[model samples]
Target: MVETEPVQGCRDFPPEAMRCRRHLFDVFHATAKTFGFEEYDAPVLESEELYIRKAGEEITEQMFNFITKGGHRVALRPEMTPSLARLLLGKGRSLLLPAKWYSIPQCWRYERRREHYQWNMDIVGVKSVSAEVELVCAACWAMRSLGLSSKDVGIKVNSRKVLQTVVEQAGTSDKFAPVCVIVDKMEPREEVEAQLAVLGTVVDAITTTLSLKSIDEIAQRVGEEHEAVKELRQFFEQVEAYGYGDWVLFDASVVRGLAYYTGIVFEGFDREGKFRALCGGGRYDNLLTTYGSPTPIPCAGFGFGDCVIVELLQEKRLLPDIPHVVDDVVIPFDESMRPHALAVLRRLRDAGRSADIILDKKKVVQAFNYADRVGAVRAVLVAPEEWERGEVQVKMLRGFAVPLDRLV
Candidate 1:
């Protein structure tokens, strides 16, 4: 037999599955609009160079990359940040300041069975902790929209500016991004130490710094007047003012896996600790400049994936089991009445009703059962007698006769 399954690690969304996904994406879009973030999109494939970085991050290492017929390198975009940067760069000087944009794109990697839909919300040219606050709030808003409460999830917040000073003290400032990448592998302490050692960084110091329990501890280590401490304080304060204080916390260790993130870094995690990060992102102010922007345009954003959140919702029994629904089903009493049934169907649909007609030959009883199975609200029976009077029978209440113009 031919292969009966989708490619490994990929999924085919049958109607029910697609409905579930649509439910999630609807929240993503609604939350975006509620937060005044405009929606945008990009191609699934992009030039491989967009994701190439020297940090050896897992995102780049697992790319679904290949060469084209003309021998040019390309790959399915593993993340949206790079593509966002490219789009912002293409806008050039004409691009407005403090632009808020969002997109839900299907990203791929050669390696989770290799595909996922990611919701990205980015604010470009914003140079303060406020952008981070808004992004975090938006994440919380989306989760809440999905019937999740703050008690179920919280965001861990930190600032890499704190790490920047430490890296400078170690005199390996140039290797700061790589150091964060290694430290993000919080476990396998020895492995992390070994990786840092290769970069001439003392792993113990990095770990000790990351282990600091509170913002006060961070201030003691980095100093209160330090930019990181100040930004961290403001971030929490703003989130509090926004009435989402309970949804976030200070975690000195949350330097996300991406090397491009330059400032405030945060990630959403389940309060029960039963799953991986539900979503993550941080500030990457220099990314645009790195991508050839004439000036460094500050930016902060987050990427929420479809996998973990769905698992969380399913576990919580929040995702509803919804069946297919149609407003009306038009049934022909017999083959002789099929033409009249189609006319009635057209009228019902033209009036903006979601109605369907039995495509195959079936008795009225069978058709009525089929309509019930498909969750049709009512069944319209187009019999010869009803057609003679320019009327149709609606089965909603023991079959009432209604004029063609009043079918809806």
Candidate 2:
């Protein structure tokens, strides 16, 4: 017999994992709805050209692509940004301005399969820093709903404008954006310097440019002359007034991915530093125009993957139980009771319950084991002796196996 195999990097989440995934989705949807953000989805399979046009070379390499028999090139969506951009450009005018939207999209990336579902939330058509503040606030609310506090996580904020000022101070032209991308990695400082040298720039200049590490240092070095620096300082002051001061910090090192992000970028990290980034996002003001709509609208959002979030929850020991709450297992006591077991199973199904019946006419102990293995909390045991008594046995697998009266 040929054995079937599960797909790589994908998972059939067991009870516990499924419970965590569901909890995450519930919090994500609830937060989006509270903010009046609409839920939307795009096709799982998209034309390869869609990604090629929007995502830079770095993202394209991570995509899973193939040619269909009809000679059309297709790829699974590796991220949600491109699809959201397409929706905004194609049908954005019909929707309300400063529209808030969220999606629990299942994205595919060949390189990274461990991350299952990703919950993405975005605010499109909003130009001011207030909109960005609202997005971060919504994220905080969602995290709090999942039992996380500001002490557990911190939001690191930085502006593209601030980084641009640093690049200008370093006497370089149009290289700040690329340099920001490198700095965003936040790896060792020496490694970033070596990368700059390979990318054909003076290592000292790059180091000096990146050296302004904090938001305050960047402002002092730029002396309030640069517009980006001025705007970011004002934005931070506003953030403080919003009273999210405890969760927010000015870190000049946070320049997200270079290709899509256009303005203020930030990332959420564990305060204890026990895990990778919980989530990250930045303003992609120019993304819509890249997809054929030349309208320069402001956009910002972040994505949280299931892998990191689940790991964090596990670390905190907050995972919930996910047993088969609504399912029933039907076990026949013996060969003579198989017909009665099928009848009870059907009756449970007709009553709108998820019912499973044991196929093998095994001993009582073996039948109970089968039901337990299938995650059935309750089991209906049919036996010749019970049928003669005009009833069946309802056993509670988790606690005690009780004998309850069965109807007909």
Candidate 3:
């Protein structure tokens, strides 16, 4: 027999599981709209070079890529930012400034890896940290919408510019991205040190910089008037003004995994620390130019994963294990009444009701049982007598009988 299971490390979203995913996506869409970010999308397949980086980024190493039959190198995109860049560049100068966009895209990685959907929210053309504040607040709002409190989840914020300044001071500025890619391996001290050893004397400064506990501590080491210090201070002030101060805090260690990020970076985490980051992203002002945009477009965005957040919700008992449900189920008393049932189905659907008709012949009792099994709020019975009166007996959670006009 052929394999019955899904590929290893992948998933199957049966109806019940799909309900949970839909519920989460609804919150994502709603939050995006609330923040004035219009939804957008890009293809799942893209040119493999879109994600390639000379910095030896981890995402590049895990890319699910291969040559196509036409001799083109392609990949199941490991992330959405590059695709976003490609689209923005294609629009060129015709694209409007200060654009806000959002999307839910399925991303993949290989090395015998897996796939998951990600909710991405991005803002372009805003040079200030206000864009970062809005993105962070939107994330918090979505979590709160899902029944999570600031106590349950918090965002750790940091500016790569802080480290950029450190790298500049150490005169190893050209290796910033590579240094960031290395520092992101915050654990495995020996491996991190071994990699940083390539940059020579700056290694000690980078370590001490990441270890600094607070933004003020950073200012003390890097100088209080530094541009990174000023921007970071402003970032927190703006978030506090938005009344989400409790939802965020500074951590010098959050450089994020991407090599393109040129400024601020943040990651959402559960307070319990039992799971990986719920989401992460940062500023990549040069990304558009890097992708061949005629001019640089400053941008900031975040990617919230589908997997870990669900796990956190499940552990918190926040996700409801609800069944598939519809507003109405239309049933014909006999096959002879099928045509009449079709008319009723049309009326129900036309009136903006979520409905299903019994496609197969079955007893009236069996039809009612099927309706109940699907958690339909009501069942419309098109019996001969009811049909003659242009009525359908509606078996509601508690039953009802009415003229066809009442339903429509």
In model 3, what is the error at residue 192, expressed in angstroms?
Answer: 1.3
- Per-model root-mean-square deviation over C-alphas: 1.6, 4.6, 1.7
The clash count of every prediction, one per candidate, is 1, 0, 0
Off by over 4 Å in 3: 199-201, 398-401
**lDDT (Cα atoms) of all candidates against the true structure:** 0.90, 0.74, 0.90
Report clash pairs, candidate 1: 9-113
| Global lDDT of model 1 | 0.90
lDDT of 3 at 242: 92
Q: Write the per-residue lDDT of candidate 2 for residues 219-305, one digit (tens) a residue.
A: 576666666566677767776787777887777667776467777877888899999888888888887876778577788888877
Model 1 lDDT-worst window of ten: 197-206
> Could you give candidate 3's per-residue lDDT for residues 1-408 as a string of tens digits?
999889986888888889999999999999999999999999999998888788888889888898989999999999999998888888888888889999999999887438999999999999999999999999999999999999999999999988887788766465899989999988598889998886556788889989999988998887888777888889999999999999999999999878999989999999998999999998999988777877778999999999899999999999978878899999999999999889989988998989999999899899999999998998899889877887878878535668988876
Query: Model 1, 177-276: lDDT tens per residue?
Result: 8888888998487788888878763566778888999999988877898998888889989999999999999999899999899999999999999999
Worst 10 residues of 2 by lDDT: 399-408
Off by over 4 Å in 1: none
Q: What is the TM-score of each predicted model, taking all chains together?
A: 0.96, 0.76, 0.95
